[PDB]
Design an enzyme around this catalytic site. Structure first.
Site, mmCIF file in Angstrom:
data_model
loop_
_atom_site.group_PDB
_atom_site.id
_atom_site.type_symbol
_atom_site.label_atom_id
_atom_site.label_comp_id
_atom_site.label_asym_id
_atom_site.label_seq_id
_atom_site.Cartn_x
_atom_site.Cartn_y
_atom_site.Cartn_z
ATOM 1 N N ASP A 198 0.711 -1.215 0.132
ATOM 2 C CA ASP A 198 0.052 0.030 -0.030
ATOM 3 C C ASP A 198 0.692 1.199 0.090
ATOM 4 O O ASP A 198 0.258 2.218 -0.272
ATOM 5 C CB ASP A 198 -1.070 0.185 1.050
ATOM 6 C CG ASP A 198 -2.126 -1.105 0.999
ATOM 7 O OD1 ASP A 198 -2.277 -1.317 -0.172
ATOM 8 O OD2 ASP A 198 -2.848 -1.482 2.004
ATOM 9 N N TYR B 226 -12.118 1.116 2.134
ATOM 10 C CA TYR B 226 -11.425 0.104 3.191
ATOM 11 C C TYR B 226 -10.564 0.744 3.895
ATOM 12 O O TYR B 226 -9.985 2.152 3.557
ATOM 13 C CB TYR B 226 -10.650 -0.652 1.944
HETATM 14 CL CL1 LIG Z 1 -6.114 1.199 2.462
HETATM 15 C C1 LIG Z 1 -6.722 -0.544 3.125
HETATM 16 C C2 LIG Z 1 -7.644 -0.547 4.103
HETATM 17 C C3 LIG Z 1 -8.004 -1.750 4.708
HETATM 18 C C4 LIG Z 1 -7.829 -2.948 3.948
HETATM 19 C C5 LIG Z 1 -6.879 -2.829 2.761
HETATM 20 CL CL2 LIG Z 1 -6.558 -4.246 2.126
HETATM 21 C C6 LIG Z 1 -6.621 -1.571 2.215
HETATM 22 N N1 LIG Z 1 -5.564 -1.837 1.293
HETATM 23 C C7 LIG Z 1 -5.956 -1.529 0.270
HETATM 24 N N2 LIG Z 1 -7.332 -1.274 -0.312
HETATM 25 C C8 LIG Z 1 -7.220 -0.826 -1.804
HETATM 26 C C9 LIG Z 1 -5.858 -0.557 -2.225
HETATM 27 N N3 LIG Z 1 -5.204 -1.302 -0.999
#
Ligand SMILES: Clc1cccc(Cl)c1N=C1NCCN1
Ligand SMILES: *[C@@H]1O[C@H](CO)[C@@H](O[C@@H]2O[C@H](CO)[C@@H](O[C@@H]3O[C@H](CO)[C@@H](O)[C@H](O)[C@H]3NC(C)=O)[C@H](O)[C@H]2NC(C)=O)[C@H](O)[C@H]1NC(C)=O
Ligand SMILES: *[C@@H]1O[C@H](CO)[C@@H](O[C@@H]2O[C@H](CO)[C@@H](O[C@@H]3O[C@H](CO)[C@@H](O)[C@H](O)[C@H]3NC(C)=O)[C@H](O)[C@H]2NC(C)=O)[C@H](O)[C@H]1NC(C)=O
Ligand SMILES: Clc1cccc(Cl)c1N=C1NCCN1
Ligand SMILES: [Ca+2]
Ligand SMILES: [Ca+2]
Ligand SMILES: [Ca+2]
Ligand SMILES: [Ca+2]
Ligand SMILES: [Cl-]
Ligand SMILES: [Cl-]
Ligand SMILES: [Cl-]
Ligand SMILES: [Cu+2]
Ligand SMILES: [Cu+2]
Lengths: 623, 623
Positions: free
Chosen positions: B301, B376
């Site tokens: 990320d 997310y």
């Molecule tokens: Cl940013 C985040 C918050 C919670 C879980 C995941 Cl897997 C997350 N990571 C990504 N989300 C779309 C791009 N990567």
């Protein structure tokens, strides 16, 4: 009210019925000698599940309300401990000895817990007819009786090296009655054989003084006089009504086992029962050291009593100021019912963390109580979430037991003060989690992950470690017995016969939240007594013949356990039966400077989680 | 305050200096095409530790305050990504290229993150050139523009099967605009090749429609018109001055990396430094499924930005209404500084459980921040305890990724709706814990328990499984790299040279709390980029050349990682050196019905504990 603990009035009735019905003449257990007849305890006898659910769900009459009395029959040719089922309340008409029924035979009289009056008589012997025989060496080490400090004694368990033994290592400590009782060991331990029914026949079988052993205190004194002994000088939105808590989302009947501790019944979320019973079964402790007591000690705390040793919660400290506070009543080692004020507390806890983010914060319902023994402290928490999840945690805190520091003592802990070692120990607790997911009939599932190398469809020349889900339905008890210190499936859930809206078996998963004290080798002559410590989590067929994973009678005779939990696991089928889950949680505790004067609750504790897994059709509602 | 993130004034000046030096051909990154030159980002360059400590401890002058600018040089015969160190602030005069110095050579242009302009250009292509080719099948399945719901694209990464690839699977979803906009996967995914510098030359290389693969969309339409395609129609005490927190017990400088995320420097309990730096390093996610994106997606990320994608904390929801909120500033894909309102919140939380027992309450300091990508949500927590302990915690929440339900989909998760699968995935986070226990020179200790069958001193015929402590000073990096999933020392701690009053090595112990996901097989040609996920805990010598365990450039080229964490572990000595701890926390997530519309942060998430172990000579006092 079929799970409600016996009222103070109810307690009196049973006590009156015993006196009037029992042939033998009884003595007040508070002042009872080993050769006397006395009522050790009376408390709620938990009702049969079938009759309880018939009442709760089908409108059948309540089961006969009953009490179980534990009677010390020491006043007879052959002394025994007898368990009497008395009922039905409010007016008893029967008194049934279920001893042989529940245990295959009589309860040996030496398995009985050490009476309070037994402790006091042991103190008389020590202070009045043992200690004076070593005044010279005691005057020397510990300013004994010469215008100096007062000393006190500490208990240990079990009491011997085999079944039939009632010989306890009692340690001698300073009576500094401030922040730490057993924080000043004198290095003097006495092995007092107190098995004889006549206290005048009790003897000290061996003495331990600051490193070495002696046959008796008279032997120690003369070697001291003869300048043969080196003496180290020691200086110093919900409504509680009866036994029932009811919120907008939760409903449960709570209680307190005088020996097994805090329990909860008929756990319903939004009208649907999640579990029949969630209760503490046993709390254990294993020590290490180069001193007798710390070297030998293996606690099965129900042998003392998690409820019996529960304390009043301090409003503002133990529970928030606006918490609900309930009382508890008990007859253990007494004639008349005793009352424990603020034994329980229920409150709302704003976690301060967003539950969902348009969203809202995490607000939780908390059911709490505290057991205290010699100042150590277990805080028992049951927390009920607005999404249907249940959290059960244990927190240890208070004063640690100490050992006099000598020789290679650091092989068994850390120095926490001059001449003071903090001996190694593990804490453990066992829970009975009788989940009834979608009703009685339950199955067990083991879901986890795996990576399998397969070719990429749009690029077959390349491979990709495909993450995927594995699922397996466990068939026998043996498959669902998970060894402590090993790995269990990441998603282990008990499921109902039916499925949710999407075809997935309605399930509630158990997630063990506890590091690993680390299991006692099965070569230990007393390991069988706490064989529940072998497993992080075990699932068995519920039986009315298997109400507990431990017993009050295990502590003083672990070599021949009254209850050996391992017996419950016997290759029986677990596919489509009424299943019980047993969770073991705990930790290793190597004491350190920070643990003085108190070990703090810093951390988030030790326990487990119960979480909906395809139980609902989507994220549930909330008020 | 030399750990402070660049201010808006500083961000502006660097952009001005960068524009003056980098010719008249720079372009605003917000509107740049691949062949253009633009400044991707500008943020603080973390200072050298020796100089930082010299300033803080020895009163030496502050080290030069600098910024790091990432520049996309797509405007030249051989395009690259360049890292420039700009300084000194406030008024810059130099701009040096540290690219080769840091990465052993050029940064290939395909590693650069995907610009927002690049995404929008991809949407144009999809909606103007691509979809229309399959109007017939889209009208039928998804009411394409026949009074039906609008469609949107969902990204995934990496973008290809090897180093040099920039080909992304974009999924097509209904844009309800209610609840989860990603709860409605159409089953259409386009493999778009946006590698070329000219957007007009971009192509779709393959299409996935509801289980079947096609060469192009026209063919899909062609196949459909011929009736050779079945289509599933889809429905519809303390304060804070600048960058520093100052409670009566704690002191630290907080901040936020544009990519790495939240961080803390100069952590001091009662005036004494425990850690130079505690920072988030990388956030990972590994999926599974029988649909393209779901089966291929491995996230790093920081390639998108835990800071760049940080969100405003909703007062009264994410943090108590009356917490102390702080803003953040950044320049990513913009030639003008942007402000992140309420990026941080710091507050005291009454734990709700007594610290000790009458006794005392337990209140903690909480530093929070939230990262958000496509609804997310990572909520980052670092709680500092009144006893010197530090809890670093991560919670996930929000909308899960969905996939079109077909075939052996349940092998890759659970159905959470009609034609909707919740694909399996693991969450993981790497933290850099640079502990300076009692100073720089640190050692590592491994402590645990053991049982030794030993005869009872007072009864030779009998034996006792003697519980004892094992201690072992670790010597090299390889010894302190404990595999995720395996068992490691229950008591591992970094210790200073000084012992406490009692002669025990003053140390802080690392207790890793996670239901760790389960490591990606090392046979995977891309796990090298997130090789930090191998270990739940790793200890290495601190090196200025090893500032982070991941990189922004890893995501789009994991096959040839810009940063491979495991390279840090090279059998160097860890006895009396500047040691850094690296901790992995994570968990397996099999999506269930309760995850819809969104998944709750229920329970406590994953992270670790930093506990004082013989660091003090007794329980620390509070103020
Ligand atoms: Cl940013 C985040 C918050 C919670 C879980 C995941 Cl897997 C997350 N990571 C990504 N989300 C779309 C791009 N990567
Ligand atoms: C543990 O000790 C208990 C108390 O001493 C024993 O329980 C008692 O056994 C008595 C002796 O057998 C019984 O007495 C009976 O009562 C009738 C009158 O109804 C007398 O005339 C008889 O002597 C006698 N009858 C016989 C031979 O059974 C008591 O009924 C009984 N008391 C209770 C309350 O149960 C237990 O037997 C002992 N446990 C074991 C397993 O050994
Ligand atoms: C990634 O791209 C960078 C920019 O496109 C390359 O760095 C640039 O190379 C220029 C020409 O080679 C440099 O100019 C030279 O250096 C001096 C310093 O300023 C100039 O005066 C000279 O005109 C020129 N050399 C001579 C003697 O002709 C630029 O300084 C430089 N640009 C910047 C802003 O850094 C990188 O080389 C490339 N990456 C790598 C390492 O290959
Ligand atoms: Cl009651 C309690 C609280 C915390 C730790 C232990 Cl080991 C406890 N158990 C016992 N204390 C002395 C007898 N058992
Ligand atoms: Ca059984
Ligand atoms: Ca059951
Ligand atoms: Ca290294
Ligand atoms: Ca260090
Ligand atoms: Cl949950
Ligand atoms: Cl043993
Ligand atoms: Cl601690
Ligand atoms: Cu302890
Ligand atoms: Cu998830």
């Amino acid at each position: 009210q079929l799970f409600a603990d016996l009222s103070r009035e109810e307690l009196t009735t049973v006590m009156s019925f015993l006196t009037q019905q029992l042939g033998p003449d009884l003595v007040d257990a508070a002042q009872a000698r080993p050769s006397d007849n006395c009522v050790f305890s009376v408390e709620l006898q938990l009702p049969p599940k079938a009759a309880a659910l018939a009442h709760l769900d089908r409108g059948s009459p309540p089961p006969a309300r009953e009490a179980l009395a534990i009677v010390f029959f020491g006043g007879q040719p052959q002394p025994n401990v007898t368990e009497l089922v008395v009922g039905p309340l409010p007016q008893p008409s029967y008194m049934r000895d279920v001893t042989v029924e529940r245990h295959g035979g009589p309860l040996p009289y030496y398995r009985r817990p050490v009476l309070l009056r037994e402790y006091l008589d042991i103190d008389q012997m020590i202070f009045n007819r043992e200690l004076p025989q070593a005044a010279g060496v005691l005057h020397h080490c510990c300013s004994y009786k010469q215008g100096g400090q007062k000393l006190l004694t500490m208990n240990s368990a079990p009491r011997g090296v085999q079944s039939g033994d009632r010989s306890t290592w009692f340690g001698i400590y300073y009576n500094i009655t401030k922040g730490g009782p057993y924080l000043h060991p004198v290095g003097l331990e006495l092995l007092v054989d107190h098995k004889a029914l006549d206290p005048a026949d009790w003897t000290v079988q061996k003495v331990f003084f600051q490193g070495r052993y002696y046959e008796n205190l008279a032997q120690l004194e003369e070697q001291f006089e003869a300048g043969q002994v080196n003496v180290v000088v020691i200086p110093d939105r919900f409504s509680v009504q009866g036994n029932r808590v009811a919120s907008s989302l939760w409903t449960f009947s709570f209680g307190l086992g005088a020996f097994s501790g805090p329990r909860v019944f008929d756990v319903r979320f939004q009208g649907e029962r999640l579990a029949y019973e969630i209760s503490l079964q046993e709390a254990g402790a294993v020590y290490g050291g180069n001193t007798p007591a710390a070297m030998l000690t293996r606690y099965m705390d129900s042998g003392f009593g998690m409820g019996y040793f529960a304390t009043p919660l301090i409003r503002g400290v133990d529970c928030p100021y606006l918490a609900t506070y309930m009382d508890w009543h008990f007859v253990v080692e007494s004639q008349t019912p005793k009352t424990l004020h603020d034994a329980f507390c229920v409150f709302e806890q704003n976690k301060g963390l967003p539950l969902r983010r348009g969203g809202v914060a995490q607000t939780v319902l908390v059911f709490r109580s505290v057991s205290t023994m010699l100042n150590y402290d277990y805080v028992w928490d049951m927390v009920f979430y607005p999404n249907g999840a249940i959290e059960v945690k244990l927190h240890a805190t208070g004063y640690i037991s100490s050992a006099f520091l000598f020789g290679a003592a650091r092989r068994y802990g850390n120095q926490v003060g001059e001449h003071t070692l903090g001996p190694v120990h593990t804490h453990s607790a066992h829970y009975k989690v009788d989940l009834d997911v979608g009703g009685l009939e339950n199955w067990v599932w083991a879901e986890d992950m795996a990576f399998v190398p397969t070719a990429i469809p749009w690029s077959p020349e390349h491979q990709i470690q495909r993450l995927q889900v594995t699922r397996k339905q466990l068939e026998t008890e043996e498959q669902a017995a998970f060894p402590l210190g090993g790995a269990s499936p990441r998603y282990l859930y008990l499921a109902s016969k039916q499925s949710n809206k999407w075809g997935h078996p309605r399930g509630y998963r158990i997630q063990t939240v506890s590091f690993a004290g680390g299991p006692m080798p099965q070569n230990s002559p007393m390991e069988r007594a706490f064989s529940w410590g072998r497993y992080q989590l075990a699932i068995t067929q519920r039986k009315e013949t298997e109400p507990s994973s431990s017993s009050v009678f295990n502590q003083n005779d672990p070599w021949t356990p009254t209850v050996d939990f391992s017996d419950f696991i016997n290759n029986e089928t677990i596919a489509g039966k009424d299943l019980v889950a047993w969770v073991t949680a705990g930790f290793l505790h190597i004491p350190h400077a920070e643990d003085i004067p108190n070990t703090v609750t810093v951390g988030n504790g030790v326990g487990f989680f119960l979480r909906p897994y395809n139980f609902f059709d989507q994220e549930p509602s909330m008020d």
